[PDB]
Design a protein around this ligand. Structure first.
Ligand SMILES: *[C@@H]1O[C@H](CO)[C@@H](O[C@@H]2O[C@H](CO)[C@@H](O)[C@H](O)[C@H]2NC(C)=O)[C@H](O)[C@H]1NC(C)=O
Lengths: 48, 48
């Protein structure tokens, strides 16, 4: 509906395994009236 | 023949209908996607 919604959570890891066992729900961070069309995405990495 | 037409003789004491009057215009046709300017919407005191 024109909006783009970010939800997130940052959980600590005992250094056990990936996506640990347990439960934790993502809170809405931003809820943005961008209003455009999305069909694809990509991520930025930094280089020093 | 000329390209422009000269900028006015903006003399103050002569200028009556002929002095520079700065002007501003607002246009807001809606009929698009999101909401962007939705008035002051004032708040009355909270009764309990
Ligand atoms: C977002 O963009 C896509 C791609 O242009 C749109 O998909 C088109 O939709 C029209 C109308 O149904 C079709 O005639 C086209 O063939 C579609 N193109 C493709 C490549 O699939 C989509 O409608 C857009 N979404 C919004 C909300 O505007």
């Amino acid at each position: 509906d024109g909006y783009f919604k970010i939800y997130s959570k940052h959980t600590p890891i005992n250094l056990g395994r990936d996506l640990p066992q347990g439960f934790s729900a993502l809170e809405p961070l931003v809820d943005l009236p961008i209003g455009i069309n999305i069909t694809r995405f990509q991520t930025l990495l930094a280089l020093h | 023949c000329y390209f422009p037409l000269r900028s006015y003789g903006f003399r103050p004491t002569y200028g009556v209908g002929h002095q520079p009057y700065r002007v501003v215009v607002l246009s807001f046709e809606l009929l698009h996607a999101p909401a962007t300017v939705c008035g002051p919407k004032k708040s009355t005191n909270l009764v309990k």
